[PDB]
């Protein structure tokens, strides 16, 4: 059974787009490391939210701010003792520029030619991810850094450092600077994840809060 | 369904 989720925010981009319909599959067992999953915010389960499964029960998860890259030691309650292969391709430009502005304190995301410059707005890096035997791309702002106060920080951890508890995962957003996910609020519960995101349905050309141009049908179909 | 998810 599929239940279909618009997507309002650009924490996934490039992987899926603001406007982009999904389809969720409904999951028993368990994500896979790398799996788009949907879940139950643990805060606020009113809220329906869709990030990465970067972390599974055990795995010690280490985040560089600086670097903006993870290190996974699998197999660690305490605390272990064994690395993931996780490694990252060469920083290239992305097909996104984002823009800030003012009335409605927010930004705008803008796909540019790479062989192009948009006056104002900030051309983000791309980076193909692997984590283990799956891989996918990420977005970061060459200007942004994480501010480390603001992290969730696991009781007994230093900062930048979480240890999976069972039962438990560590969810990222794929647009890594624009992002609020697990490094600022925790774990998700397994009881709280819905399914996993498996394709479009359909897609609209779109900006956060208004309405669209037009379509992007070329965008139907599996999620790469 | 046809909600959104952040
Ligand atoms: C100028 C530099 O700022 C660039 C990006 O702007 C943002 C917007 C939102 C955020 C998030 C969603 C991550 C807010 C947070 C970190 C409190 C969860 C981070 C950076
Ligand atoms: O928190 C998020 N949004 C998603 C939808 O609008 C309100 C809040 N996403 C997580 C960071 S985001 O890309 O702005």
Redesign the pocket.
């Given at each position: 059974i599929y239940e279909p989720f618009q997507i309002?925010?650009?924490?996934?981009?490039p992987t899926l787009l603001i406007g982009d319909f999904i389809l969720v599959e409904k999951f028993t067992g368990h994500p896979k490391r790398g799996d788009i999953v949907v879940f139950k915010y643990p805060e606020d389960p009113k809220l329906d939210?869709i990030?990465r499964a970067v972390g599974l029960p055990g795995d010690k998860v280490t985040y560089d701010p600086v670097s903006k890259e993870l290190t996974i030691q699998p197999g660690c309650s305490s605390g272990c003792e064994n690395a993931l292969p996780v490694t990252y391709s060469n920083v290239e430009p992305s097909d996104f520029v984002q823009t800030f502005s003012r009335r409605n304190a927010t930004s705008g995301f803008f796909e540019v030619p790479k062989n192009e410059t948009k006056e104002n707005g900030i051309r983000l890096s791309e980076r193909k991810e692997t984590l283990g035997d799956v891989t996918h791309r990420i977005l970061t702002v060459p200007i942004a850094q994480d501010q480390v106060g603001m992290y969730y920080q696991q009781p007994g951890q230093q900062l930048a450092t979480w240890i999976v508890p069972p039962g438990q995962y560590f969810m990222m957003?794929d647009?890594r600077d624009?992002?609020?996910?697990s490094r600022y609020w925790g774990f998700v519960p397994e009881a709280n994840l819905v399914g996993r995101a498996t394709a479009i349905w359909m897609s609209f050309d779109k900006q956060?809060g208004e309405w669209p141009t037009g379509l992007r049908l070329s965008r139907i179909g599996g999620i790469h | 369904x046809x909600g959104?998810?952040?």
């Amino acid at each position: 059974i599929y239940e279909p989720f618009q997507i309002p925010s650009g924490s996934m981009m490039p992987t899926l787009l603001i406007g982009d319909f999904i389809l969720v599959e409904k999951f028993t067992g368990h994500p896979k490391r790398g799996d788009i999953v949907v879940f139950k915010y643990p805060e606020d389960p009113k809220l329906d939210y869709i990030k990465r499964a970067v972390g599974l029960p055990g795995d010690k998860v280490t985040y560089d701010p600086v670097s903006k890259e993870l290190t996974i030691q699998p197999g660690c309650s305490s605390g272990c003792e064994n690395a993931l292969p996780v490694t990252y391709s060469n920083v290239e430009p992305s097909d996104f520029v984002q823009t800030f502005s003012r009335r409605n304190a927010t930004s705008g995301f803008f796909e540019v030619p790479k062989n192009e410059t948009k006056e104002n707005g900030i051309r983000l890096s791309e980076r193909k991810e692997t984590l283990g035997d799956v891989t996918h791309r990420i977005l970061t702002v060459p200007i942004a850094q994480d501010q480390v106060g603001m992290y969730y920080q696991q009781p007994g951890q230093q900062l930048a450092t979480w240890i999976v508890p069972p039962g438990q995962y560590f969810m990222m957003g794929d647009n890594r600077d624009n992002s609020a996910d697990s490094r600022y609020w925790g774990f998700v519960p397994e009881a709280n994840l819905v399914g996993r995101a498996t394709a479009i349905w359909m897609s609209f050309d779109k900006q956060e809060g208004e309405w669209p141009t037009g379509l992007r049908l070329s965008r139907i179909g599996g999620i790469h | 369904x046809x909600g959104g998810a952040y």
